[PDB]
């Protein structure tokens, strides 16, 4: 996977839009995993630590 | 504009694109805070959880 700088044009055309859709899926998956840590957010909340 | 490039193509990269603003922002929310919830957990020693794969 080298540099996309070189075909600017050519790359971004098809990397660009496929590397937001995935980054659409990555970062859907980050929210699950913070999902798991909302549990601990939620003892922090309910209990008032603070 | 492009002959090749419709609206087709660029509605669904538009649309991706908006996906993408969406649910990073949703991240960091979570984050920052989780983030304050790391440094709790690092005193605890629960930093690492278990993570045997």
Same mark, same amino acid.
């Given at each position: 996977?080298?540099?996309?700088?070189?075909?600017?044009?050519?790359?971004?055309?098809? *990397?660009?839009?496929? $590397?937001? *859709?995935?980054?659409? $899926?990555?970062?859907?998956? *980050?929210?699950?995993?913070?999902?798991? #840590?909302?549990?601990?957010? *939620? $003892?922090?909340? #309910?209990?008032?630590?603070? | 504009?492009?002959?090749?490039?419709?609206?087709?193509?660029? @509605?669904?990269?538009?649309? !991706?694109?908006? @996906? +993408? @603003?969406?649910?990073?922002? !949703?991240?960091?929310?979570? @984050?920052?805070?989780?983030?304050? !919830?790391?440094?709790?957990?690092?005193?605890?020693?629960?930093?690492?959880?278990?993570?045997? +794969?």
């Amino acid at each position: 996977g080298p540099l996309g700088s070189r075909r600017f044009v050519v790359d971004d055309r098809r *990397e660009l839009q496929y $590397r937001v *859709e995935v980054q659409n $899926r990555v970062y859907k998956k *980050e929210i699950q995993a913070l999902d798991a #840590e909302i549990r601990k957010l *939620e $003892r922090l909340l #309910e209990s008032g630590l603070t | 504009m492009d002959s090749a490039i419709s609206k087709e193509d660029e @509605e669904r990269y538009q649309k !991706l694109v908006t @996906e +993408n @603003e969406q649910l990073q922002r !949703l991240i960091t929310q979570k @984050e920052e805070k989780i983030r304050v !919830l790391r440094q709790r957990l690092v005193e605890r020693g629960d930093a690492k959880g278990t993570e045997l +794969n």
